Amino acid sequence: GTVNWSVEDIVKGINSNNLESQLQATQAARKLLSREKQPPIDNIIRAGLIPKFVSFLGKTDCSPIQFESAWALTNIASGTSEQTKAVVDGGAIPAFISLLASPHAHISEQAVWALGNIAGDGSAFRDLVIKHGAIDPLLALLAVPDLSTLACGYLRNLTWTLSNLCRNKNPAPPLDAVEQILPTLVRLLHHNDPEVLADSCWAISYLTDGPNERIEMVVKKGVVPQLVKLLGATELPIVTPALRAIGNIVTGTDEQTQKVIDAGALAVFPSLLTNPKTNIQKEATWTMSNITAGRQDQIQQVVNHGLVPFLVGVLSKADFKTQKEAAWAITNYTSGGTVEQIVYLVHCGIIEPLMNLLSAKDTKIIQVILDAISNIFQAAEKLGETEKLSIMIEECGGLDKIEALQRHENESVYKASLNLIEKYFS
Amino acid sequence: TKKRRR
Amino acid sequence: ETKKRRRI
């Protein structure tokens, strides 16, 4: 019975000069720390136990206590930053890296998990694990001809820990470390386990969340087609990270955006823009807005894939945050589109849902919508149809909303609305 | 750039 | 995703 010990009892055994007594007390600690109901992490720390557990990690002659202390420390490091700091301050990082070479797979697996929790705390501990040299021995655990010969849960823990070494910003991970890890990530992105695939996508989503140079590192490895494939998965835990990565990539250059289009991404958006999960719809529309902010041949691909009606749809009815991203998508479209393309947008029914959003209580969206209108009127000037458009806006309740906005707090608001009235409604 | 980031 | 994981 190593179930239900007190912290006092645990200390009494760990302080005995008896390796087996110490092993029993350490397993008692592990069991305390792995219960679902409020594990006593702070009590264990305050008792002074972390250095003892860390020293046990190196008892190569007694693998069972290696395992139990590894598990106990993993769960202490699963806590707050203060609690994770206590494990790091105990010297655990070099000890856990040594354990990655254990002949016992359940012990090296536990060291992988622990290092994951430590790197997961944030930039500084992530960089400290990398400085202690964790990356080489981690990648060596995956150097096998066929990943399917590894145990499912073992491979899942490795992938998870690798994703945490790619995670966080200010600063982003070291470029040399990212180069070392990317080949393996690419391989894991082609493995058939849903969990490996979700964490592999999260990892790529972290790496692509930066300057164009970071994006380029990823795009150069050729993973965009595989990302678009996973974008079409049925498992929402895969789609979510894959969509986030595609969206990061289209914040880049027009040349990087094009590789996403060339890979087929736009064919998946009819479903993404009608997806029942609000965050999918939000992220798909933000991605669309960064695509309508590209070249005119790229706006044209949006048109050819039949996505303008779906943007009209999201503008008409969706969570407000999604509608806001849809408005951005329209302003970018009208700002960089041809005349023919802006005409098409109007013929798809954009004006009424655009007008209905002017009575929203968000200052920024109103600015966005007014810019878009302005842009459309400019295209109507070029066709000398500014009157037809004025009538249209009048017929759906639009002129009322624009005139009311003239007497509105913000400056850009009253300036832009007053301009429109003077210029097209006189 | 009209492109917006996260 | 899930920053940090406890083993139960």
Give the start-to-end residue ranges of the domains of chain A.
Answer: 1-425
- Residues A272, A280 contacting (CB under 8 angstroms): yes
Q: Name where chain C breaks: residue before each gap, C-N > 2.5 Å.
A: none
Residues 292-331 in A contacting C (C-alpha not used; CB under 8 Å)? none
The two three-digit tokens of residue A402, written as one number: 């624009």
Q: Which residues of A touch B5 (CB under 8 A)?
A: 251
Candidates A240, A290, A298, A375, partner chain B, best to mutate (most B CBs within 10 A): A290
Residue A380 to residues A85, A372, A375: CA-CA distances in angstroms? 63, 12, 9
Q: Note the helical H segments in A189-277.
A: 194-207, 212-220, 224-231, 236-249, 254-262, 269-272
The two three-digit tokens of residue A157, written as one number: 């823990």
Phi, psi of A114 (to 5 degrees): -60, -50
Please tell me whether residue A15 adopts helix, strand or coil conformation.
coil
**Touching, A vs C (3+ Cβ pairs under 8 A):** yes
| Token pair 């878009």: residue | A372
- Residues A245, A204 contacting (CB under 8 angstroms): yes
Beta strand extents in A105-198 (DSSP E only): none
Q: Which fold has domain A1-425?
A: Leucine-rich Repeat Variant (1.25.10)
Flag if A293 and B3 touch (Cβ within 8 Å): yes
| Residue A238, amino acid | I
* Structural Rg of chain B based on CA atoms: 5
